[PDB]
RNA sequence: AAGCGGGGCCUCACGAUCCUUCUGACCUUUUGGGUUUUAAGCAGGAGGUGUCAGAAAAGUUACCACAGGGAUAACUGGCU
RNA sequence: GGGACGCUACGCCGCGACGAGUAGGAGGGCCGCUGCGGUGAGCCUUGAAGCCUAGGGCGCGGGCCCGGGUGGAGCCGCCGC
RNA sequence: AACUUUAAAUGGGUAAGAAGCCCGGCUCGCUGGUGUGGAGCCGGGCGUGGAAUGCGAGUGCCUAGUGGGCCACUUUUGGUA
RNA sequence: GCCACGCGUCCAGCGCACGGGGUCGGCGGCGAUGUCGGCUACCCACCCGACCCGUCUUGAAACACGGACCAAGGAGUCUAACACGUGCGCGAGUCGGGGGCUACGAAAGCCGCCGUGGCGCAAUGAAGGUGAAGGCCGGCCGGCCGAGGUGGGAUCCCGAGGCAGUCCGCCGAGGGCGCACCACCGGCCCGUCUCGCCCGCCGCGCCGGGGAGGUGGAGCACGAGCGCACGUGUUAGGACCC
RNA sequence: CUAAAUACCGGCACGAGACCGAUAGUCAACAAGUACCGUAAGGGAAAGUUGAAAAGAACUUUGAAGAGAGAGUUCAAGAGGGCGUGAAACCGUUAAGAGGUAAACGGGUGGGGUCCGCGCAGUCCGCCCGGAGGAUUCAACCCGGCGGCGCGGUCCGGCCGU
């Protein structure tokens, strides 16, 4: 008899991506070799993020990537984004950039290359920098989804601002007793 | 019996709706019938435009 | 070439359609893995079987 | 692919004709059997007659 | 795919995933949203605050066509016209400000959310905000009313 | 490419058969008859193939050229060897090792040729 | 004067939605526009559900019926 | 300045620790039935399906393959649905 | 038990550092004998990682079943039991 | 008994083996019409164990209920809505689902000057309505800088050093830019409360608006949704079956 | 007053199916709204299959006959008139085994049958030696064809550029 708990002896994490596409798998096969043969942790973050789900590797807007290269690793340094690199329409000027991404929106490819930039794929990144040397790894807003506004502390609770699940917002759609100080109570 | 978190829903299925159910399997056959009558009308007014006045 | 176009020219018979981009370009990873550029930044392979 | 080959047109007797046509970029499109299997198994449900 | 559903793994199990004490009866809690002022009070307060009661004025014959006043921010103001006009606006030495007709693209009101590039504009719109006007005047533009 | 087409043929291929907890492939150039990346005769640009002769006496060695990759009528050239047992194994070893032609399968062709010559040997 | 007091020295003496009534405004709507009644709104009190997180509610069946309950009685058997 | 095996990478190999179970949840099924799109130059009156079987066996198991008898006309393997 | 001057054992909080000390200086519409007091900002100097032992931790969604319990040492209520 | 082997200057091969999990380079017999072997599956004998299943229950073998036996059938299905997770395509966009044009084909393809319209891209207030950074300099105006900060932050950058003498790469005390995300302090939008100084026009007031400090919002603060499919869960439907 | 877009589980004639296959699918695949039941309103079944072709068993014999035994048809009567395939519950008979704690079961053996291994003289495969043999036979050269590679340090010319 052993007094140990098997409640959480099995760690829950992704070993291989649930996608059945073959182009990601060939990129995954390439980065499994780089993780266990090189000493860089960059090949350990990229390989971990390649397994991740669509909601875990949020799209990265172009204006955010301009903003993070206004405060870069001190200027030639490439950008590595595991998700999709999307275009932003409220940005006016774009500099020349070195961008690595799984997918780039068609307008963003034209906008980056118009400024003299360069777009690389993940197999080209390994040929350029096998160890991730001189790279900046970025990500989109993980909590940027509208789903997270419904999460957290439940509504109808003091200081628990959270969007309720309503079919349509209006004057007679959860503005009564649970919200009005005139009618019953409020939180 | 509601669950932990969810919406308040009003499904309008309290009538005998199963009797009055309109399927749309006539739609691919209806499109042929609309086209054949339109083509037959155009040949009747062959010099006049097919749209009309 | 007119129904789907190349990558630098859109289709002339579709309203708005171009060929999809590639997730990766050099799909033959055997050529990539023994290419010299990776081969410098690799540790020594450990292939001595150490059983119990 | 960077360079695209030159496909030769064949005659009615199996011999190669003098005309040659550049390979379209459509044949260089990515191969995604999962998406093809997704489309094929979904479009086969449209040519189905209802039973009840 | 019925082969991928839960019922294929539940064959041979007596209670079919519904328990032996609390059997899967027909309607133990009542049909629909029963018990708002009753046994389902806590779920109706902890998750749907404000469900019960009336507030506001009634409006008998409301037409949504009358209240149609779409808005656009100063972020996507230059996206309305093509990119060619933006390049030539800063390139032109005479100072001829291009005209962006907001009603033409399908918006009526202009809001001053975003930054404007430093080149003059002529903005024709059905309505304007106060902060949207000062941003346009701050660049050296003009706000033109149109109906 | 070789790695791209392998991910498609690995499960949905007509030459592959699976039964009795085993997996095999019936490709014309798949020596060792196993479904694998190295031994697939159709996948790779350079392929070694060993087949019995048409007349039953000797072995034919299938050689795949690199010129007409999308020209299957020209891509394959076939040479017939009808010499003694030691000299036949010496020639197939020479065509693979000394030409540096896909050298991980040199002994696999030797194993296949050594059994095909034994198969056509007069039966006791 | 420092200070104390927005009830009773403290531990208890009280009430959701909807509806009604009163009060507060140089407040909003009353619908195509304007004026005036009226009506509907915002905010703050009150009119109560004591089964007190709040249904509008008399009996009898020995002519009785149904789903059940040994979770619950009349009998035997058990413990005292 | 002339040489053993390997690697269906969804594969193979090495270390340690652990293995109860009602309700309930999850994962893997080269477990089983029916029909459809592909696929096996698949099986078949020199004998299909079905059924019986004191035989040989395989898999922990769901089950499966051969041997024998009856039977006379269809049936199955793999990839998806 | 509805008394208490005393008063245990068992038990319940807190602390055992780097988010800690020691300096120097700005701001305040807060408080004013007095750069008084307080708070917030900065900049600087101190690592023997400041009890023992053991252990990888933190965190976000969806969620079934359950909401009749019983027995055993010790304490104890009602009841003769 | 000894895990001690050289000089001067200054203060290496051969064999043996308690050695990274067993070998024999050791043997003896019997095997053609009566012998060898055959876990399992056919039958029988013995020892040990062993109460008939399902269900309700704190408690079933119960003197608690269903149940002679066998074959076939026989019970979480379908539509709609929603939530979450996952896969795919596009991406501040996305989508024809309704409508037109070109045996299987009732398919498939095409039409965005057929995107009308659905969702998102802006919220707040009952409503009228309103509707999303500032600072510095010079004299309310004219120029400039122009998208918040602190702490923690995977990753990336430099090199005090160290692997006669240079290059590559290594690692490295220490020093930084800091992704996502968390905590906090600020800033902006709408309603409400309080307090003021004011300015100004096309019709100078019971006018129009700004400011400062609290407070409420399902807000902003360099997007993330749309379409399809799958699974789970909750419902309305006959709704797991009687 | 007025056609078109619209609806159509009745009727006429059609075409089709990722539908079901005689306890399924309409109640009804068949002399089915039939047999049958109730005074009546109404309720309402069960029931497909010899064989390719009846070639449906001539004739002899027992029995009163039903029923058999021979013979004959058929590829097959082991398809013989409710007849294709003929499972289980159940019953009859043959062979084997066993039998006073109802029967049955799990683990471990042992014994007896059943067929099988087609075992009954127990492995061959490579390398070297020996000697017996038998070849049209080796290495090395010449000619022709094919293929690979080349950093030909950069030969020459084509073609393409996500």
Curated annotation (Swiss-Prot), chain E:
It is found in: Cytoplasm. Its main location: cytoplasm. One of its GO terms (cellular component) is cytosolic large ribosomal subunit. GO terms for biological process: translation. PROSITE patterns: RIBOSOMAL_L15 (PS00475). The modification Phosphoserine is found at residue 67. Keywords: Acetylation, Cytoplasm, Hydroxylation, Phosphoprotein, Ribonucleoprotein, Ribosomal protein. The modification N6-acetyllysine is found at residues 46, 54, 109. Hydroxylated on His-38 by MINA. The keyword Acetylation applies. The modification (3S)-3-hydroxyhistidine is found at residue 38. Residues 1-29 have a biased composition (Basic residues). InterPro entries: Rbsml_uL15_N (IPR027386), Ribosomal_uL15 (IPR030878), Ribosomal_uL15/eL18 (IPR021131), Ribosomal_uL15/eL18_sf (IPR036227), Ribosomal_uL15_CS (IPR001196). Residues 1-36 are annotated as: Disordered. Belongs to the universal ribosomal protein uL15 family. Component of the large ribosomal subunit. The ribosome is a large ribonucleoprotein complex responsible for the synthesis of proteins in the cell. Component of the large ribosomal subunit. This is Large ribosomal subunit protein uL15. It comes from Oryctolagus cuniculus. The lineage of its organism: Eukaryota, Metazoa, Chordata, Craniata, Vertebrata. The gene is RPL27A.
From Swiss-Prot, chain F:
One of its GO terms (cellular component) is ribonucleoprotein complex. The modification N-acetylserine is found at residue 1. Its main location: cytoplasm. It is found in: Cytoplasm. Keywords: Acetylation, Cytoplasm, Isopeptide bond, Phosphoprotein, Ribonucleoprotein, Ribosomal protein, Ubl conjugation. InterPro entries: Ribosomal_eL28, Ribosomal_eL28/Mak16. Gene3D superfamilies: 3.30.390.110. One of its GO terms (molecular function) is structural constituent of ribosome. GO terms for biological process: translation. The modification Phosphoserine is found at residue 114. Belongs to the eukaryotic ribosomal protein eL28 family. Component of the large ribosomal subunit. The ribosome is a large ribonucleoprotein complex responsible for the synthesis of proteins in the cell. Component of the large ribosomal subunit. This is Large ribosomal subunit protein eL28. The lineage of its organism: Eukaryota, Metazoa, Chordata, Craniata, Vertebrata.
């Amino acid at each position: 008899g052993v007094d140990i708990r098997h409640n959480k002896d099995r760690k829950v994490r992704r070993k291989e991506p649930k996608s059945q596409d073959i182009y990601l798998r060939l990129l995954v096969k390439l980065y499994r070799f780089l993780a266990r043969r090189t000493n860089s942790t960059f090949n350990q973050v990229v390989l971990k993020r390649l397994f991740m789900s669509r909601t875990n590797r949020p799209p990265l807007s172009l204006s955010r990537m301009i903003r993070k290269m206004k405060l870069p690793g001190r200027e030639n340094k490439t950008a590595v984004v595991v998700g999709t690199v999307t275009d932003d329409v409220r940005v006016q000027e774009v500099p020349k950039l070195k961008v690595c991404a799984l997918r780039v929106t068609s307008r963003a490819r034209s906008r980056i290359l118009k400024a003299g930039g360069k777009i690389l794929t993940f197999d080209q990144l390994a040929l350029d920098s096998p160890k991730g040397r001189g790279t900046v790894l970025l990500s989109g807003p993980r909590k940027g989804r509208e789903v997270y506004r419904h999460f957290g502390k439940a509504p109808g609770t003091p200081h628990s601002h959270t969007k309720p699940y309503v079919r349509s917002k209006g004057r007679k759609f959860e503005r009564a007793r649970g919200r009005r100080a005139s009618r019953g109570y409020k939180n | 019996a509601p669950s932990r978190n969810g919406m308040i829903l009003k499904p309008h299925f309290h009538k005998d709706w199963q009797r009055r159910v309109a399927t749309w399997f006539n739609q691919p056959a209806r499109k042929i019938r609309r086209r054949k009558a339109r083509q037959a009308r155009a040949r009747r007014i062959a010099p006049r435009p097919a749209a009309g006045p | 070439d007119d129904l789907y176009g190349t990558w630098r020219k859109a289709a002339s018979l579709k309203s708005n359609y171009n060929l999809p981009m590639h997730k990766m370009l050099n799909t033959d990873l055997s050529r990539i893995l023994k290419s010299p550029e990776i081969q410098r930044a690799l540790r020594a392979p450990r292939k001595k079987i150490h059983r119990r | 692919a960077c360079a695209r080959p030159l496909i030769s047109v064949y005659s009615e007797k199996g011999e190669s004709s003098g005309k040659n046509v550049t390979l379209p970029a459509v044949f260089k499109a990515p191969i995604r059997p999962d998406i093809v299997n997704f489309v094929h198994t979904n479009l086969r449900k449209n040519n189905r007659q209802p039973y009840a | 795919p019925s082969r991928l559903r839960k019922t294929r793994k539940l064959r041979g199990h007596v209670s079919h995933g519904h328990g032996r004490i609390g059997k899967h009866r027909k309607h133990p809690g009542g049909r629909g949203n029963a018990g708002g002022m009753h046994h389902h009070r806590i779920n109706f307060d902890k998750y749907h605050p404000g469900y019960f009661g009336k507030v506001g004025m009634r409006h008998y014959h409301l037409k949504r066509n009358q209240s149609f006043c779409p808005t656009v921010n100063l972020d996507k103001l230059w996206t309305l016209v093509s990119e060619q006009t933006r390049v030539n606006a800063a390139k032109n030495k005479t100072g001829a400000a291009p005209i962006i007709d907001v009603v033409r693209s399908g918006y009526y009101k202009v809001l001053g959310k975003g930054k404007l590039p430093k080149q003059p504009v002529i903005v024709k719109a059905k309505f304007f905000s106060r902060r949207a006007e000062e941003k346009i005047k701050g660049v050296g533009g003009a706000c033109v009313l149109v109906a | 490419s070789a790695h791209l087409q392998w991910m498609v043929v690995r499960n949905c291929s007509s030459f592959l058969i699976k039964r009795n907890k085993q997996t095999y492939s019936t490709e014309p150039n798949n020596l060792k008859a196993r479904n694998s990346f190295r031994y697939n005769g159709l996948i790779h640009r350079k392929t070694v193939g060993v087949e019995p002769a048409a007349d039953g006496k000797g072995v034919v060695v299938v050689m795949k050229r690199r010129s007409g990759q999308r020209k299957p009528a020209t891509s394959y050239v076939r040479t017939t060897i009808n010499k003694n047992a030691r000299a036949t194994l010496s020639s197939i070893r020479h065509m693979i090792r000394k030409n540096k032609y896909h050298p991980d399968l040199r002994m696999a062709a030797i194993r296949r040729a050594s059994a095909i010559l034994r198969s056509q040997k007069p039966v006791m």
